[PDB]
Design a protein around this ligand. Structure first.
Ligand code: CLA
Ligand code: CLA
Ligand code: CLA
Ligand code: CLA
Ligand code: CLA
Ligand code: CLA
Ligand code: CLA
Ligand SMILES: CCCCCCCCCCCCCCCCCC(=O)OC[C@H](CO[C@@H]1O[C@H](CO)[C@H](O)[C@H](O)[C@H]1O)OC(=O)CCCCCCCCCCCCCCCCC
Ligand SMILES: CC(=O)O[C@H]1CC(C)(C)C(=C=C/C(C)=C/C=C/C(C)=C/C=C/C=C(C)/C=C/C=C(C)/C=C/[C@@]23O[C@]2(C)C[C@@H](O)CC3(C)C)[C@](C)(O)C1
Ligand SMILES: CC1=C(C#C/C(C)=C/C=C/C(C)=C/C=C/C=C(C)/C=C/C=C(C)/C=C/[C@@]23O[C@]2(C)C[C@@H](O)CC3(C)C)C(C)(C)C[C@H](O)C1
Ligand code: SF4
Ligand code: SF4
Lengths: 186, 79, 663, 86, 119, 131
């Protein structure tokens, strides 16, 4: 069985299986395949949200700390974190800014808390397997009750995630190279 | 002070003494309270180490024991 | 029947030998007792730290020493002894003021470097460390209860199958697990402790050493070198960066073994099984031996590098701190070094399973197959070093007594000089490629002379002989040609009788007893070398190739201030030093009789004394001796007591000499 | 009390029995040697521990072995004279 | 003044270096005459017997002192040993495995741990 | 028949030969036979036939000998390049001394030399087992 029987390896021309793995990592690391699918789904979801929030600020910009909330999508990370002391280390000597402190570290700490009580709580305490890889039981009531419908919905999630990962890479690289608007072209 | 040794006399090394008290009596008493706590706890620990483990507690002691869920994992993870 | 007077010595000789306990029946009890003892010992250490901090806070002058450290002297604690003169003034007090003692430990420089400025901070630190002692004792109680609760949970435990008895071996998996312990030690206890100390330095130590600066920016991590000019110590920025680097390296290393999950990390057993090891890692004596053998290089390098590269403020400016610290840590590491061999011998006696006769698989097996070759070659190198060091020293002594200093044999220390030249070229290349050059390294490289070569050969001789005695005891602990059943007996036993040639000092414990004398002698040689080179580098460089120089220009000459301490002319602040000097001489000589005179003489003497007591009018009607029968000390007890007296005398005779000579 | 054990290598010398100062050892019949006798230690409670038996034993390594047990000493194993433990 | 801590010393030093040591020595010599004295190193104490029996009462440590403990199916082991000895039994030898093991387990050492008779 | 010493020795040999084989089996359960003790872990035999089994190299057990050889040589080249370009050619000490920063590529690469050593060890181990 290819890659422990995970959704995502089936071709689209049907009657065929893309089972894309030129490096053969699925057979080299079968004990970390659930972690591989966890990472793939996490990257896909983060990249979907990242592409959406790479397009949107070109139109609307939340009015806030003017130090951030300004500039191109490229100059929006190092600007919305400011000259932190070393890296993601709050300046306790001068909280309330007045020189150097973060503006996203709140997003960072929220992501850390959610991740620890999310993936870490799923793996360390009293358990992830092949089937429950990306399944955090979030919005499963919306999932249809049919064996193939769930499988095709998961496949659509996976393929949208891969497309969003590649798309975000291309979009951010083009924006860095050129600037410009949504087309991200010279 | 009457110094001894060649270097103290030939260099003028001196030992200053504070004219104040150092610690007030209240601070010494505050330290002695926690020292007494250490002392009581240490006497209890010495008693427990002297008597050692009692395996026959399961015949008389209440409860049913407990193995923490991580201790079970550490048991079955290996040695 | 009941016991005799030797019961006290017999009990106290194994008072902490938890393996020899009578109620102890399993590794669970042994491991839990050891863990609780560890907790109590940590509590003792914390209370000792809080003690020093309190006495510096209350009965001391830290607030004044911090202002003018170079010429000032710290105070250890007050003197309250009703035996002193209730009149006049002792030489340890400024007339009517109280009596004080000068601290030679070095805690003042430690606290000053660490960022202490006020007595109040030291008081709060004392309170916190007493709190930590409470916490340690409560953790001991907690773990005793948790293990007893597992034991009680065996009242609701059954596998429904005959394999349920397998749980017997996993009850102490909390203590006996190795992979988790290694992972968490090397990661947390080493790397993250270093990283936390880097944080401490960046937040306190560097801020409280210079003018106010930026918000602890990454410019606080420097790569200067050594010996900041003003304080004559390492740069605090360099120390913080060093701890940061060590912390990062050890944190990365700590993810090696399979600690919490079975899917990450390699097992230590599999690491050893595919190497030249695969030892019995379940032995507690083996682990103790190989970690005592780890604290030994650490403590020896601590002694070397506290002096060579002084890390504390104004530590080099104290003529007594520098010698006392070095000698103290050298003695500590010598004790740990001989401990490693003693517990290796105990491991071979008690906790080592060997194949039938020929299976050369275990490392101890391969060592034991050719143990005679090891001991013979160690004897050869020891004999060579002793012969050719004593003979050259004798040549120098004789030819310099005969008015011929130019007839000496002075081998120029060429190999050490080459190593020093290479290191100096490397350091100078480092310095010359700096825009902030003109740095100093203090005594990292020192002038090396023929006297240095001869003393190094003497030190190598001492180390070789100590290792020879200890290694012979370890290898023949399980049986030698003279006594081919030694593993059936205890680790320490009296002898094997006067027959078969005579068998005094045959146990492995007797090998340790013999080796402790050589450990003390080698340490004395090392300490004499360091102290002599510290007192007068020039006179050591020229006149130290003949032993008469060591006898006259060091011992006889430098003992002048100490003996003059208390006399029929008045007393100095060295009076305690001279009194302890004489007391330690008495202790050293008192242990000669426990070593030279042996039991039977004294047993007859005790029989005569007991005859007197049972013959004295009143005693006989109250005490017939049937209860706690007085007997002469047994043979092993006698050897140990003589060894204790000898060790105490030899060790404690030196600090008075150090204080008298340097202060 | 000590522990005096007799091993199969005994050749019935009787020297160990003769050397014992407290009559701990004795000769018993056996069939494992040409002498048809081996030593025995039926009364090791009287064994002071002098190890004269080991001195007298001529086998390559002693057929009789005395194991000292100092935390075990009784009044007989100590040779107490001025004092009675009974 | 720099003194005024000697008010603590004048009580603590005499106390902890005279009263406590003397009380400790008296308590130690009193403890020396208890039947429980040094029960962990001195053989033949009552508490040692009680502790050993308490360990033996635990279901895990019942057959812990037996050097032969571990054989999951001792009947299978004995049957296999008997079968292997039958094929190697020398000529008309009359020794069986059962009585051979029975007489190899029974030795004659009356003076072993005889100190388990007083307490 | 009387039990001669030779017959007793024969029983000793028979008993030892049988029991030494029996105790290796699943029916003796000694603490020295636990995991982490003498016996190998259940699914991970380390040494068989006097040869390092494929399970020694851990997660690399599935790698081919050619893949490990290529990785070994590539890592050796990259790590040796990093070490030589950090120490002797293109030194970074002067650049970082004046307030600069290390060429992070050199630092990352230089750690691939011992990795390459163990990678080529693993390549040989894989080749021996025919993988
Ligand atoms: C300096 C070392 C030293 C010392 C102190 C002693 C002391 C003694 N030896 Mg001895 N001995 C020694 C070395 C020494 N020996 C050596 C190297 C050998 C070579 C083998 C011998 C061989 C030897 C033999 C063969 C004999 C002795 C005997 C004696 C005893 C007779 C002297 C006596 O009773 O005085 C009293 C003991 C003193 C130490 C005098 C000083 C007492 C102090 C200063 C006063 C009390 C202090 C005070 C109470 C403090 C309290 C303690 C504190 C914890 C509170 C005595 C206990 C003989 C004996 O026991 O016959 C009676 C005997 O037969 N010795
Ligand atoms: C990977 C996702 C991601 C990341 C890292 C960022 C990061 C950033 N965004 Mg952004 N954004 C995103 C997605 C993301 N965005 C999406 C999906 C939208 C569309 C609503 C926007 C719309 C948006 C605007 C309008 C602006 C930013 C801005 C910024 C910058 C300042 C931070 C801020 O306040 O954002 C604000 C972001 C939001 C209010 C949208 C949050 C939506 C999150 C991603 C969904 C919640 C995820 C949660 C963990 C899952 C549970 C909920 C789920 C059921 C949906 C920062 C670089 C500001 C800036 O300076 O731009 C240059 C700004 O003005 N973003
Ligand atoms: C305090 C903050 C915090 C913490 C504790 C975690 C914790 C975790 N994250 Mg994570 N994450 C965070 C913030 C945080 N996240 C943020 C802000 C983002 C961006 C939105 C992500 C994006 C992210 C992704 C995309 C992935 C994780 C993954 C993980 C898991 C593995 C981490 C690991 O091995 O590190 C590795 C250490 C590194 C330094 C990574 C190397 C840098 C790469 C190669 C670039 C772990 C549960 C992984 C996971 O869940 O695996 C299934 C995973 O694939 N995280
Ligand atoms: C794990 C140990 C440890 C701890 C507890 C702290 C704690 C602290 N550091 Mg810190 N630090 C450490 C190690 C540590 N440091 C090391 C090893 C480095 C070197 C990389 C630094 C470099 C550093 C900088 C550069 C700064 C801090 C700052 C701070 C403060 C707020 C930062 C924070 O995360 O608050 C929650 C806080 C007192 C910041 C601060 O407040 O400045 C004084 C700041 O600017 N630290
Ligand atoms: C035939 C004489 C002879 C020979 C060839 C050797 C050879 C050896 N001995 Mg040696 N030894 C000898 C006599 C001899 N020994 C005597 C008489 C003693 C008693 C003092 C020793 C005591 C001794 C010790 C304690 C050690 C050796 C060791 C060694 C070995 C290393 C070399 C060494 O240390 O030499 C140095 C030799 C000495 C220090 C002993 C003194 C040399 C004597 C005086 C020479 C006597 C020669 C003899 C008079 C010739 C007469 C010839 C005539 C009759 C025709 C080597 C195999 C060492 C070893 O085992 O390491 C591998 C070792 O540790 N030997
Ligand atoms: C001045 C005191 C002194 C001296 C000179 C020696 C000399 C020696 N001891 Mg020794 N020892 C001493 C005191 C002394 N011991 C004491 C007090 C103890 C405590 C019991 C020991 C315990 C001890 C042990 C346990 C061992 C030695 C060994 C040695 C030899 C080391 C090899 C060597 O250097 O040979 C060179 C020979 C000389 C320097 C003697 C001079 C020869 C002529 C004059 C030239 C050597 C014979 C070791 C040994 O046998 O090594 C092979 C060994 O195993 N000694
Ligand atoms: C320098 C010596 C050295 C050597 C020869 C190995 C060799 C090995 N390690 Mg390892 N390791 C090392 C240092 C080393 N490691 C250090 C310093 C760390 C801490 C970061 C680790 C952390 C580590 C983990 C966490 C794991 C390994 C694993 C492995 C095995 C698989 C190799 C692999 O996939 O790596 C590429 C292999 C036997 C893996 C394994 O097989 O475990 C079962 C595994 O899970 N190692
Ligand atoms: C400065 C101080 C440094 C000097 C101290 C150095 C002493 C070296 C430490 C070595 C200690 C370990 C050796 C040891 O304990 O066993 C040394 C021996 C070991 O005891 C022997 O043990 C054997 C079993 O292993 C047998 O049972 C022997 O019969 C028994 O004598 O201990 C004694 O003989 C102790 C007798 C003296 C007891 C004095 C009590 C001390 C009270 C004051 C505190
Ligand atoms: C209680 C509760 O809540 O339950 C929850 C459960 C759950 C599951 C969390 C939920 C959900 C689902 C969610 C939130 C789904 C969101 C999905 C998103 C945002 C997908 C974006 C994909 C973007 C792509 C593919 C971009 C593709 C972009 C491409 C290909 C770009 C292509 C470009 O060529 C173009 C077009 C321009 C060129 O210049 C270059 C580039 C950029 C490459 C619910 C509904 O909330 C309910
Ligand atoms: C830049 C910047 C920042 C940033 C950033 C970020 C997030 C940068 C992210 C970069 C990122 C995310 C880059 C992804 C690349 C993905 C690639 C190359 C995929 C190739 C995929 C290929 C070539 C696929 C090929 C195939 O399809 C082919 C042709 C046939 C198919 O049958 C099969 C396959 C699959 C084989 C900071 C640091 C945050 C702040 C700073 O201030 C500004
Ligand atoms: S001396 Fe030895 S060999 Fe002779 S009878 Fe006695 S035990 Fe046997
Ligand atoms: S040690 Fe002495 S008393 Fe004991 S059996 Fe041997 S000879 Fe007899």
């Amino acid at each position: 069985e290819f890659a422990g029987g995970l959704i995502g390896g089936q071709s689209a021309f049907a009657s065929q299986e893309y089972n894309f793995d030129p490096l053969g990592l699925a057979e080299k690391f079968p004990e970390q395949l659930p972690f591989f699918r966890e990472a793939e789904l996490k990257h896909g979801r983060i990249a979907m949200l990242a592409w959406v929030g790479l397009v949107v600020p070109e139109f609307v910009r939340i009015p806030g700390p003017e130090k951030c909330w300004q500039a191109s999508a490229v100059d929006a990370h190092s600007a919305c974190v400011x000259x932190x002391x070393x890296x993601x280390x709050x300046x306790x000597x001068x909280x309330x800014x007045x020189x150097x402190x973060g503006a996203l570290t709140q997003v960072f700490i929220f992501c850390g808390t959610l991740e620890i009580c999310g993936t870490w709580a799923k793996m360390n305490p009293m358990g992830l397997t092949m089937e429950n890889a990306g399944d955090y039981r979030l919005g499963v009531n919306f999932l249809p009750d049919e064996p193939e419908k769930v499988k095709e919905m998961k496949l659509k999630e996976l393929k949208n995630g891969r497309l969003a990962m590649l798309a975000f890479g291309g979009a951010i690289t083009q924006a860095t190279l050129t600037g410009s608007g949504f087309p991200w072209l010279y | 002070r009457v110094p001894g040794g060649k270097r103290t006399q030939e260099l003028g090394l001196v030992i200053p003494m504070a004219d104040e008290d150092g610690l007030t009596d209240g601070q010494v008493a505050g330290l002695f309270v926690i020292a007494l706590v250490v002392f009581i706890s240490a006497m209890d620990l010495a008693k427990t180490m002297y008597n050692g483990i009692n395996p026959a507690k399961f015949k008389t002691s209440k409860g049913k024991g407990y193995i923490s869920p991580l201790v079970k994992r550490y048991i079955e993870n290996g040695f | 029947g009941r016991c005799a007077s030797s019961r006290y010595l017999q009990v106290l000789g194994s008072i902490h030998d938890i393996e020899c306990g009578f109620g102890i029946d399993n590794t669970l009890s042994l491991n839990l007792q050891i863990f609780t003892a560890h907790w109590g010992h940590l509590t003792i250490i914390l209370i000792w730290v809080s003690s020093n901090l309190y006495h510096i806070a209350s009965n001391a002058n830290y607030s004044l020493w911090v202002k003018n450290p170079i010429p000032s002297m710290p105070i250890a604690h007050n003197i309250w002894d009703p035996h002193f003169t209730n009149s006049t003034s002792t030489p340890y007090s400024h007339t009517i003021i109280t009596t004080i003692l000068i601290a030679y430990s070095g805690i003042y420089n430690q606290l000053y470097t660490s960022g202490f400025n006020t007595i109040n901070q030291i008081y709060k630190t004392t309170f916190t460390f007493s709190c930590l002692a409470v916490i340690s004792i409560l953790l001991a109680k907690i773990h005793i209860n948790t293990h007893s609760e597992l034991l009680h949970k065996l009242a609701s435990h059954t596998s429904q199958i005959p394999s349920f008895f397998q749980l017997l071996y996993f009850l102490d998996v909390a203590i006996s697990s190795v992979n988790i312990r290694f992972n968490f030690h090397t990661g947390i206890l080493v790397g993250l402790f270093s990283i936390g100390y880097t944080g401490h330095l960046l937040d306190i130590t560097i801020p409280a050493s210079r003018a106010p600066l930026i918000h602890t920016s990454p410019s606080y991590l420097t790569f200067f070198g050594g010996l900041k000019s003003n304080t004559s110590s390492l740069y605090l920025t360099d120390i913080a960066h060093h701890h940061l680097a060590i912390g990062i390296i050890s944190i990365l290393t700590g993810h090696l073994y399979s600690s919490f999950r079975a899917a990450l990390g390699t097992y230590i057993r599999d690491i050893l099984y595919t190497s030249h090891l695969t030892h019995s890692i379940k032995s507690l004596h083996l682990a103790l031996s190989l970690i005592l053998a780890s604290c030994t290089p650490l403590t020896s390098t601590t002694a070397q590098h506290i002096y060579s590269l002084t890390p504390y403020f104004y530590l080099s400016y104290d003529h007594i701190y520098s010698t006392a610290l070095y000698v103290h840590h050298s003695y500590i590491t010598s004790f740990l070094a001989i401990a490693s061999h003693a517990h290796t011998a105990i491991t071979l006696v008690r906790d080592w399973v060997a194949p039938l006769e020929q299976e050369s698989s275990s490392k101890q097996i391969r060592i034991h197959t050719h143990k005679a070759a090891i001991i013979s070659h160690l004897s050869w190198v020891s004999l060579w070093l002793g012969f050719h060091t004593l003979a050259v020293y004798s040549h120098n002594d004789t030819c310099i007594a005969f008015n011929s200093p130019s007839k000496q044999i002075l081998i120029e220390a060429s190999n050490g000089q080459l190593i020093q030249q290479a290191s100096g070229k490397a350091l100078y290349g480092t310095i010359n490629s700096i825009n902030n050059y003109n740095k100093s390294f203090d005594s990292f490289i020192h002038p090396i002379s023929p006297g240095d070569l001869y003393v190094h050969h003497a030190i190598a001789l001492g180390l070789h002989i100590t290792v020879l005695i200890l290694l012979k005891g370890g290898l023949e602990a399980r049986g030698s040609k003279l006594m081919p059943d030694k593993m059936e007996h205890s680790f320490g036993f009296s002898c094997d009788g006067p027959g078969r040639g005579g068998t005094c000092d045959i146990s492995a414990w007797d090998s340790f007893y013999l080796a402790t004398f050589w450990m003390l002698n080698s340490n004395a040689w090392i300490s004499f070398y360091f102290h002599y080179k510290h007192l007068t580098p020039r006179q050591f460089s020229e006149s130290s190739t003949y032993l008469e120089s060591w006898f006259r220009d060091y011992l006889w000459f430098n003992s002048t201030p100490l003996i003059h301490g208390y006399s029929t002319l008045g007393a100095n602040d060295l009076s305690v030093q001279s009194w302890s000097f004489l007391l330690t001489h008495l202790a050293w000589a008192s242990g000669f009789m426990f070593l030279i005179s042996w039991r039977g003489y004294w047993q007859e003497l005790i029989d005569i004394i007991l005859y007197i007591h049972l013959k004295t009018p009143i005693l006989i009607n109250l005490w017939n001796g049937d209860i706690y029968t007085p007997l002469a000390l047994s043979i092993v007890q006698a050897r140990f007591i003589g060894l204790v007296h000898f060790s105490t005398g030899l060790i404690l005779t030196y600090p008075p000499f150090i204080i008298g000579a340097t202060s | 009390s000590h522990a005096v054990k007799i091993y199969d290598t005994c050749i019935g010398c009787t020297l160990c029995v003769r050397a014992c100062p407290t009559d701990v050892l004795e000769m018993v019949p056996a069939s494992i040697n040409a002498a048809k006798q081996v030593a025995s230690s039926p009364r090791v409670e009287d064994c002071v521990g002098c190890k004269r038996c080991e001195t007298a034993c001529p086998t390559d390594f002693l057929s009789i072995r005395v194991y000292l047990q100092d935390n075990e000493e009784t009044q007989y194993s100590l040779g107490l004279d001025l004092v009675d433990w009974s | 003044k720099y003194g005024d801590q000697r008010k603590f010393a004048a009580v603590l030093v005499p106390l902890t270096t005279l009263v406590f040591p003397a009380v400790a020595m008296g308590m130690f010599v009193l403890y020396s005459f208890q039947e429980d004295a040094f029960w962990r190193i001195v053989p033949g104490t009552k508490r040692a017997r009680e502790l050993d029996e308490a360990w033996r009462e635990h279901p895990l440590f019942a057959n812990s002192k037996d050097p032969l403990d571990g054989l999951i199916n001792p009947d299978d082991y004995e049957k296999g040993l008997e079968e292997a000895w039958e094929r190697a039994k020398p000529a008309g030898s009359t020794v069986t495995v059962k009585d051979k093991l029975k007489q190899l387990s029974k030795q004659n050492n009356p003076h072993w741990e005889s100190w388990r008779a007083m307490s | 028949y009387t039990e001669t010493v030779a017959d007793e020795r024969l029983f000793e040999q028979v008993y030892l030969q049988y029991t030494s084989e029996y105790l290796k089996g699943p029916l003796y359960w000694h603490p020295d036979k636990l995991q982490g003790w003498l016996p190998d872990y259940p699914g991970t035999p380390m040494i068989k036939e006097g040869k390092y089994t494929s399970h020694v190299i851990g997660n690399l057990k599935a790698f081919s000998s050619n893949e490990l050889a290529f990785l070994s040589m590539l890592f050796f080249g990259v790590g040796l390049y990093g070490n030589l370009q950090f120490n002797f050619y293109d030194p970074q000490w002067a650049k970082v001394d004046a307030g600069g920063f290390f060429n992070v590529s050199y630092i990352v690469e230089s750690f691939l030399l011992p990795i390459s050593f163990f990678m080529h060890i693993a390549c040989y181990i894989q080749r021996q087992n025919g993988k």
